Design a protein around this nucleic acid. Structure first.
Lengths: 52, 208, 97, 90
RNA sequence: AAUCAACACGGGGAAACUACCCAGGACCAGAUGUUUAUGACUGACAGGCUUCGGGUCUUUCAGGAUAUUGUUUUUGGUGGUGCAUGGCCGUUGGUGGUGCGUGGGUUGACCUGUCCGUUGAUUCAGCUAACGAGCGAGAUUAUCGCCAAUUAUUUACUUUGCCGAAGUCCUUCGGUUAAAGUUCUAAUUGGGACUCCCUGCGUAGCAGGUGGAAGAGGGUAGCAAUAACAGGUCCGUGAUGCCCUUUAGAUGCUCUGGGCUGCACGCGUGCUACAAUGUUAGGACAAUAGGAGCGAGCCUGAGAGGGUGCGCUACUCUUAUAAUCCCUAACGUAGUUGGGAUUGACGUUUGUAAUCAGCGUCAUGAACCAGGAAUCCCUUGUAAAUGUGUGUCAACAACGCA
């Protein structure tokens, strides 16, 4: 366990995953959401985002 | 100590995790959404469900399983968290509740006709202008094929969808294949009930 | 006496306009003297298809942030009473100057 | 799994005291409340479930372990405490 | 993934991780159903083997039931099947369409309702064995443009008054909790445009005109019916059926290194040019974003860069005196001060790593003289030029969204 390669500023750090997804394919870091897009768009209306 | 941006987004992200949590606990109690009140030191949350007795049985032990699960997750202090419950009047017209009734049946091997026209009758008699029920996936054959059962009338377009139309999507895993359940329910406007204003289609002329 | 600022923030405008009415209403009762900040559109522009298939179409998701600032001279006794609205998705930061 | 002995007790006490422990779904993740790797509470949690001492509910990459009737009777046998004896208070 | 509807698409700008692929070496996440307190299993100093080692090995100390052996099968899998499926999305087609109740026609599939002008429109008008209810269209929502109410002297400004500096008799700057406000600034509630008005044409409406901030859906978006495509995605998911993998010399997970960047060649989207309506040198107005990371001012160095870290939880502080254009010079029709590819070296930043990253410096100074047959996009603040933010991001945009 405790993977020894550093991962400070790195794509596969554990912060960088989609929180819901657990996967990192297509991540939204802006406004500190840290959520994958497919994962995002299922549950965007709950967060208070809306189409206009 | 946050920005004016982040206090909105943290509270949004709080709510959506909280709501996906209380899908998976309160399936038996019959969940119907919630509201979150945020204060710097105090948090008050209204859970809403049909079977309010099923909480209060065993002198309110079931709520204290949930309340610790919230408290330990976000590491909030007790006293500073303040959960209530409040009952659903008219279970007929809430979408998440009636989804669960159609989920309850199709596990226990009722035909899909009879499962829909159970709830689609129960919605309309309770008090609603229309409702639609879709049961998408694999019954009988190797190909999947779509049932759609509708009554009343059901508005699909514009802004006026968002105000009037309640809806709820889900799925049932089975021995054979993954079905999808899907129930849209349109409402009547009340005079200041619990929508207020009428549709932008309709107008009413006074009598002379 | 430490002329105090409220700073009222919201996602939704109807839920805001209740709280502004109350916190302006209560300065009528207490009689404290009473003194719109520009709103943000947090636009996030995700590609709406999951896979790479199909014509590249993009949903636009604006979260809106309405923000108002009341402020007044008030003596710490009177201000404790006014602060205590409680609405969904509204915030009120108190700020001493 | 090999746990060390001292960390093992203060998990099963944090289980017994609270009733619900939360742990990140992700393994090799530092754990709050009790400090350790997040493999440690997670892998013991599914051991209890097989025997049937707790219920697992999973949401948003977070695992919740709500402790049932049997596990309350078991952990009095383990720690050696009189009955009554957590977070079922009213 | 392969016509449109694959080919700057998978937000896929891969130096490691990401990562599936290839070469080595570890780990057990071996859950739950005979051995062992007289040590089941576990951790490691130095020096050997070795890419590097408590993987192994010569030594020999540290812990303490969390077990071992065999039997069961959990769980994990970016393994296979999108021709088993859920959801989501593109498309047929955002075109004007779709089909119920009762009645009538037909043996019946089925039809009628849903048919001579008008509209973007099954939009209205009117015909009429049909009459009446729907859904889509419209309405509504969002913003841009014009208004005047409602607030604002420590988050925007203006006027007047004070105190400064120059001018040096009235002009321009900078400052001010100091008096009055709202034309600029910010954003809530309402008003506003309806083919209403006039003239032609044909009741439905159409064309022009006056006025008007705006005139014919005010502009632009958003939302968008039923019915289907074996179109896409099991490489987004604790969405998932079945198949096989778990014989641990693993298709689980992880460490070091390498790949996805390999080039006789063929196509797609783009970028920069072929100059003089230009380049070179010197001089002289934006908007939308984002930010407890942005990074003020002042020093250091040709330059890139470096040091010190003021303000700001933001209409306050900051990225931030944009670039075509304009005005003085230089050049002179040449593969030329056009063009800036490809190569040699030095000076550096980011990073565990520069071996295929970016920036600077001096040298090197290519193909290209407007592009055959073919094809694409576009009607007004549009095309074209011209920059700036943002997404990815430690570092890197010729790309996407604004």
């Amino acid at each position: 366990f405790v993977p020894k390669h550093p991962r400070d500023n790195a794509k596969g750090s554990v912060e960088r995953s989609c929180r819901i997804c657990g996967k990192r394919r297509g991540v939204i870091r802006q406004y500190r959401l840290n959520i994958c897009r497919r994962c995002f768009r299922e549950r965007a209306e709950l967060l208070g985002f809306k189409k206009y | 100590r946050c920005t004016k941006v982040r206090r909105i987004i943290e509270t949004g992200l709080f709510y959506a995790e909280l709501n996906e949590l209380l899908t998976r606990e309160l399936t038996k109690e019959g969940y119907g959404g919630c509201e979150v009140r945020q204060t710097p030191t105090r948090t008050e949350i209204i859970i809403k469900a049909a079977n309010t007795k099923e909480f209060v049985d065993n002198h309110g032990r079931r709520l204290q399983e949930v309340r610790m699960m919230i408290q330990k997750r976000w590491r909030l202090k007790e006293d500073s968290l303040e959960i209530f419950i409040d009952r659903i009047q008219r279970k007929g017209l809430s979408a998440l509740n009636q989804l669960e009734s159609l989920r309850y049946k199709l596990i226990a091997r009722i035909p899909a006709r009879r499962a829909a026209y159970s709830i689609i009758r129960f919605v309309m008699d309770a008090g609603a202008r229309g409702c639609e029920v879709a049961i998408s996936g694999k019954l009988r054959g190797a190909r999947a094929s779509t049932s759609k059962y509708k009554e009343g009338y059901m508005v699909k377009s514009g802004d006026v969808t968002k105000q009037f139309v309640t809806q709820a999507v889900g799925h049932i895993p089975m021995k054979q294949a993954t079905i999808g359940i899907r129930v849209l329910i349109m409402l009547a406007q009340d005079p200041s009930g619990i929508p207020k204003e009428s549709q932008p289609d309709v107008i009413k002329v006074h009598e002379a | 006496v430490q002329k105090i600022r409220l700073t009222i923030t919201s996602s939704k405008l109807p839920n805001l306009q209740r709280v502004v009415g109350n916190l302006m209403g209560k300065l009528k009762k207490g009689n404290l003297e009473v003194r719109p900040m520009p709103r943000r559109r947090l636009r996030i522009t995700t590609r709406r298809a999951p896979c790479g298939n199909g014509t590249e179409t993009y949903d636009h998701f604006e979260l809106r942030i309405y923000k108002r600032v009341i402020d007044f001279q008030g003596t710490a006794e009177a201000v404790k009473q006014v602060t205590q609205a409680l609405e969904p998705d509204v915030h009120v930061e108190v700020s001493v100057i | 799994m090999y746990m060390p002995t001292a960390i093992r007790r203060r998990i099963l006490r944090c289980l017994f005291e609270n009733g619900v422990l939360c742990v990140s779904d992700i393994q090799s993740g530092t754990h709050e409340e009790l400090d350790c790797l997040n493999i440690y509470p997670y892998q013991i949690g599914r051991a209890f479930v097989t025997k049937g001492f707790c219920i697992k509910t999973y949401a948003w990459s977070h695992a919740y372990y709500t402790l049932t009737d049997k596990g309350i009777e078991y952990l009095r046998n383990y720690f050696g405490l009189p009955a009554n004896a957590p977070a079922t208070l009213r």
